[PDB]
Amino acid sequence: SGIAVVAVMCKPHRCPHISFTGNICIYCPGGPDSDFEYSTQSYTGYEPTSMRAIRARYDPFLQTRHRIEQLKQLGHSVDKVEFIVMGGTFMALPEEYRDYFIRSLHDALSGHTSNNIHEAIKYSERSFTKCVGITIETRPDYCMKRHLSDMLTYGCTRLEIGVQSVYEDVARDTNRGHTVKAACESFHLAKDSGFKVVTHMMPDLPNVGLERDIEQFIEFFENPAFRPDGLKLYPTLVIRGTGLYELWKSGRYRSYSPSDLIELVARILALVPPWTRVYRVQRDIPMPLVSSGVEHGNLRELAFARMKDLGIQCRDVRTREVYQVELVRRDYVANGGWETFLSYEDPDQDILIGLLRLRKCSEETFRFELGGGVSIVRELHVYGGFGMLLMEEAERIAREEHGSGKMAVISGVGTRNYYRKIGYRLQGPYMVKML
Amino acid sequence: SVLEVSHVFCCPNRVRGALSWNTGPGGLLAFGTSCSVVLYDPQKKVVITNLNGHTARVNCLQWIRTEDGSPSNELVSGGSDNRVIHWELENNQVLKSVRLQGHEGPVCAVHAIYQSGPSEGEQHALIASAASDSTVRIWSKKGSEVKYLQTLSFRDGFVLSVCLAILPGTNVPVLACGDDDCRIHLYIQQDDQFQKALSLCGHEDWIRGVEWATFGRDLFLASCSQDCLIRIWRLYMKPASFTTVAVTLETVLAGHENWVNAVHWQPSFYKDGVLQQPVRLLSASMDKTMILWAPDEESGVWLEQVRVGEVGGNTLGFYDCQFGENGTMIIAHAFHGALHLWKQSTVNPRQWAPEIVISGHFDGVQDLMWDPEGEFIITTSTDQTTRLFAPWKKKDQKDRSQVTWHEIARPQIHGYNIKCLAMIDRFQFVSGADEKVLRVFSAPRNFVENFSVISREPPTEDHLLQNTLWPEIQKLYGHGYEIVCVACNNSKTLLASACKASQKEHAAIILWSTASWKQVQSLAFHTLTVTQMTFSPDDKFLLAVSRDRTWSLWKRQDATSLFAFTNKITSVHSRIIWSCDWSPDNKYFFTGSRDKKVVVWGEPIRPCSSILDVGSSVTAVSVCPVLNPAQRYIVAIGLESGKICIYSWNKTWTSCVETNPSQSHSLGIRRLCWKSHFASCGEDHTVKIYRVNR
Amino acid sequence: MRNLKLHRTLEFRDIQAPGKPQCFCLRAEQGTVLIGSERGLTEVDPVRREVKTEISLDGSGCIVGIQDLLDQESVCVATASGDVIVCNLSTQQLECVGSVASGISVMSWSPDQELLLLATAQQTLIMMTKDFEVIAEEQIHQDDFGEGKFVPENALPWDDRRPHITWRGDGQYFAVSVVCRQTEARKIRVWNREFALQSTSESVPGLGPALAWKPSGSLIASTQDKPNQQDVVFFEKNGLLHGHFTLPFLKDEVKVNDLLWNADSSVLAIWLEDSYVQLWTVGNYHWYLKQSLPFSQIVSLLWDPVTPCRLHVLCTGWRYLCCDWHWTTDRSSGNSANDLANVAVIDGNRVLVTVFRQTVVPPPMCTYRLLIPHPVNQVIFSAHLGNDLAVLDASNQISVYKCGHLEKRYSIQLQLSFLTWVEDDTFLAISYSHSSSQSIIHHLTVGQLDVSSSVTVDGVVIGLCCCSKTKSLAVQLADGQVLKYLWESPSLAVEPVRFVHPCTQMEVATIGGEECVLGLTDRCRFFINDTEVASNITSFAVCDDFLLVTTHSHTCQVFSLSGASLKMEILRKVERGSRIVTVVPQDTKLILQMPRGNLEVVH
Ligand SMILES: C[S@@+](CC[C@H](N)C(=O)[O-])C[C@H]1O[C@@H](n2cnc3c(N)ncnc32)[C@H](O)[C@@H]1O
Ligand code: SF4
């Protein structure tokens, strides 16, 4: 039936910008230089995925096996899975560990003993463990041509980036080591190569007021340059061993009141476009690890109650999921290239059962499989044959309006077979059709 | 002169079908390590020699079976260098290989068997191989020259081959390959072209194991898959007259409720003058359990007799199970790379058979150091563990001769990879792993009892996996980055550490106190990280060599007349320096860099004496402590390719140049430790003990 | 998107009172303009002219402040000598309530007119309440007091040292721009209501004297002429450079003099001196140069402080002008029974088209862009034949005709307000009478040169109707609808009856066998044949006798006109910022619009 999520973690290391400035990002706890010994960056060590990883001694095979066995024993025995890689800049490491990690992670599916990543995926595509995608987190100065190619080779579908703010002074202050234009370039390259970007934003950064937050989020959700496909809300927390704790001890920094936070979250989640999903709303850190901040992790229901009391009703994808549905199409310009978003909406009770995203190749897209004059289907999803209908509409739009000759779709290695019943071939990691 | 290898320590690769046991009397074991195949005699406890012929990892081994129940001593090995090789021994030393041509893909499993064609006088064997590009290819032998009979592109796309099995049915060769989804392909040749006889399909999931057998007139085909089912077909046929095959299905079992990586029958052995082949099926599942199936139990149920294995410790099971000479002892291959042997000993419930299985590192060995007096040896490797070997002098109650060597303890199971190591006491040692600190481990009192028991029974696998750890005592903060090289003092008073550095701020050598564990000095001259550095035999000097192609004799007051000396140089070498060594009389010191130019410097001015070029780059240099009356020196250098060269240096050619072994090391050497006889370690799981006699 | 267009235009010529005008103000509830003049002169001459001229307390030759109260029933004036004099016109009373012997450079008032502050000529700033008594005073100083975790010659040749002062829409903060003489540059700083410094200005390499604040309270404008180009930059509330947009003019040949915002924070007005006045707007962070107006010397400009989209201009020749504006798209829909639809959009020196039958295109993208040298001013499509478009530019009144590639024809050789198009070659370009304010319809048709004709009519015309199939014109007045005006014959103004309120949007539709009149006003009231049906209509569309309306309450409604009768699933709920754009008759493709800048298609 449903798909069970599998989470992994990497080995501890140092973020790449420490060699130039001399310190890591201010608000980030944990790591090799913190009291949380043998814990990766941006993590304490007391979280489910975290202690499973640390008791696995950080090897993909063992922890994948534990997760799969536990989920199977629970009484589900799912068919598809989706990997998630967590913790630190995954491609700041030497390529040898990257290759070893990904190849062993893929081999842990059925049992092959691949010597290299190529044969690893070429054998994984023939498995019964229908893995549909892998997610990788990367910072903007390490999302470039080579890094994007490496992404595509491992067969990942979505990637996550942390911008956390749209003001240059905040980047200069918190010592991120990269200007805000890097976020623009990273979004441009990632979006014009078939990937689905989900971004990270935090309320209540240092030296950021309250009205400035709503203004920056309005700029975020209205400016074509900064429109993401997925929102990652993370309230700011103060945790020892970081520059933020040093500031907070001297009485400089301060945190929002509970009611102010509830109202701000309600306002932000009220202005989210219907085509944007909200992955995470709160941080996963337990109670006693954070000194000041939200001390209760049920922020979802409080925000929903505040919105209900307010007078605005959410249109997020998370709450708009499962008498006749109808095809609705939306358009907008994001990151410098015309897009389109098709769905099957039920405006009676305001839900949906099927959706699809399509985008025209903007210009000078380096990915040779595209080569210009093509279209990309960034995601398809079905709930519960609507999929072939959505593909029909997408083909019609590609042929008629875009004026394209070839079309391509990104798919996980476990589903590239499902696009063969339609008449697609394989070029690179894409399924390809001619118009 | 002479150069004999006393002992080696190795470990099988993690492929499914890595080891194979010979049939009949005097069975023999052969498995694979990083780039080689290692032999092993179960009767004894010693390794004879390795078949160093490959360039990549070796993934399949198979004995060429001899029909008349006699030892064969010819085998086939397929590697990850796109190479299938046929080897002939007929003895304990004959190393003759054929080194067939490319397969275009790393093979996973192969097979071979004798044709049994007497009409053509002595008949020969044939080989069927499958690879990454989903093809099956036939290689035959008809004497000295190999025969490329035919090629068969098994499929075109990603329709792979899961296993392979060979046995002639009655008169003609028959091939049984595996198609991933559910299928088993049974082929047959007319004259030389193999044409598809039939394809069987009864498995819901991926098929993993396929095995032949013969009983009376009926062939037997055993198979095991991932669908919680073990599937057997008794089969009576006639060879294709153009006739076809007449397969029969039978009852199945409910074994292990998990994946089954391997399954096997029982071979035929010579006893009381006749050949016996019992009806036995033995599996190798993943739930750390193994079931001894029995034939029909006089009714057809085929129920077991005892299932060995406890689900407690390891849930990842095994990759192989094979027989001894007969139904006496059964061997299995663990997931992590260890072996497990069981013996019955005239009793129906079987028990373990320890003290026989050889064990070694399953990841590259980085460093080792000799015992202070010569009792044991300690090795560290990138498998996140440390291992301790010591010889067994408590040999059999009547056989006290031929002392062997066995691993004794697993002190630490760490969470990083270990890079540097030094010994500070008989029962204490310091290790620097990937962390920015150093750790110190000392022997407990629960170890010395068994140590004196065995070195004045060797531990089992479980005892090493659960109950051999050494408690930690110390922790050495003070570095910023990884630790690259450490040294030690003659009298166990001073330490010397160096951290992985890229600038001149972190390139500072740090000295410590053995008694108090406190930093007392910090020297800084080198522009980059110090790759190696060593004390002199006397405390008058301390030499260092770094990656900045320059050396430094930079020593100052310990502060715990001058009791040190300093001198440096601008540049002499052209590439990164690797090794530095001293002399027994402290009169000369030797440096060897990657540009394979070993240079001596004499004991102000520090000029050279002569330069020497070596066929390959150097990675380790050591000098024999024992002097010679003719005022000469002995150097034993270890190179990148896996070779050791012994030279004699004479004061002012006149330098000995010809002393080196063959079949020495597959991959790079890291260090060479003389005994105060020397030991060699490498990046290919190989640690060996040598001997020189002159 | 939408495009501004001209509307009811007003012009007055009262009389040449003493000397010249300096600064004026608008009185809302009594609807008049009061002007200050040198030689002590407050004249409420405009409108019915209840003129009350008084001699203000020789003296200084300039007066800086003139402001209505509308609650204390007086007008406050201040002169360059620093004499805040409360005066009431109905009684001819004078009193120097406030006076400082230093001088006054500028006068400003709170949005709610509760507090005020003055800039003395001795480089100090003082703050008073309604009672003209000083409560606090500071000067220009350094040491911004570490707000936030933050803590050569570069002056313009023509820079004026007079400081500028602006307030915020909600009346919580006010910004002051002055000159620093130690470094010879420009500086800005923000103060709160309780009159305490809250921020400063970062270092900038060359800034002008202009200043303006968005009534929404988000941004602040400035000049910042670059070494290579010339820009208009923004300063957020905490005083940092955040965004900018570039003027299309050349280096060292123009200067900026003023910046303004309308009442609803949706139109930006800019004053350029060599002179031009331009109105812009914001799409998706793209600044559309909507309209331009070139004038030869203008004394002052003023947005209407009560109703949006109304500008007042005072010139040196004793000329006073008032202009209105309209907010509606330029659609080509209803062109023919054929399945046709597309929209035109004005931007800078070009026009962006979106074909909605064969494509769907978001605002910043386009299909068939068209470039014109001078800025364009208006566009329009035909009645029944084809979809060729006529465009008028705001520079030389040249008409350019585009054939629907894109065959072009134009004359090779303010006024011209409504250029209605009749298919063959016909331009209907209404106008107004100077100093008499009466509508003057025209009849202009195309080495061919444009030739016009002149006819007259009483009344003020609000908005022409659309010439439907084989139909002549139709005009709106301030009350009712008249002047059927047969196309080929100047005709009478008989009724087709009496608008309750002049509808903002209007149309005539052949409902069944009867030609009915439809309209929609700012009250959201939807009027049919002088009947109020519903009071919650935001946008409307009619085609193939189907009406489509927006309930403004989260619903879009459809109702057939086949029965030619209506009176206050089928419905389909919609989000908040809905606004209907062109429709397809057969495909029933209703294109809905949201405020963020995207589209939506619903069948
Ligand atoms: C698991 S991290 C994402 C991985 C990592 N931050 C990266 O660079 O991709 C999720 C978010 O937590 C944020 N974060 C880090 N430290 C935090 C803290 N002390 N309180 C709240 N959020 C924090 C990061 O900025 C990031 O956007
Ligand atoms: S780069 Fe990301 S993970 Fe690393 S310190 Fe900065 S915020 Fe934390």
Numbering used by the authors:
A (entry chain C): 85 to 406, 418 to 479, 496 to 546
B (entry chain B): 4 to 245, 268 to 481, 544 to 647, 656 to 698, 709 to 757, 764 to 787, 811 to 828
C (entry chain A): 1 to 57, 66 to 159, 185 to 307, 318 to 339, 345 to 452, 479 to 487, 502 to 534, 544 to 593, ...
Please share excerpts from the published article on this structure.
In eukaryotes, wobble uridines are modified by Elongator, a large and highly conserved macromolecular complex. Elongator consists of two subcomplexes, namely Elp123 containing the enzymatically active Elp3 subunit and the associated Elp456 hetero-hexamer. The Elongator complex harbors two copies of each of its six subunits, namely Elongator proteins 1–6 (Elp1–Elp6). Decreased levels of wobble uridine modifications lead to ribosome pausing, incorrect protein folding and consequently trigger intracellular protein aggregation and proteotoxic stress.
To determine the structure of MmElp123, we vitrified freshly purified samples in absence and presence of in vitro transcribed mouse tRNA ArgUCU. We optimized the sample preparation procedure, collected large datasets and solved structures that are with and without tRNA at 4.35 Å and 4.0 Å resolutions, respectively. Strikingly, the CTD of MmElp1, which is visible in the yeast Elp123, remains flexible in MmElp123 in the absence of tRNA. This observation indicates that yeast Elp123 is inherently more stable in the absence of tRNAs and that the binding of tRNAs induces structural rearrangements in the Elp1 CTD of mammals. Surprisingly, we could identify an intact SAM molecule bound to the iron-sulfur cluster of MmElp123, which was co-purified from the host cells. The coordination of this ligand is similar to the 5′-dA molecule found in ScElp123. Nonetheless, the structural similarities between the subcomplexes (pre and post SAM cleavage), suggest that the cleavage reaction itself does not induce major rearrangements in the active site of Elp3 or in the coordination of the adenosine moiety. First, the MmElp123 harbors a SAM molecule that is bound to the iron-sulfur cluster, indicating that SAM binding occurs before tRNA binding.
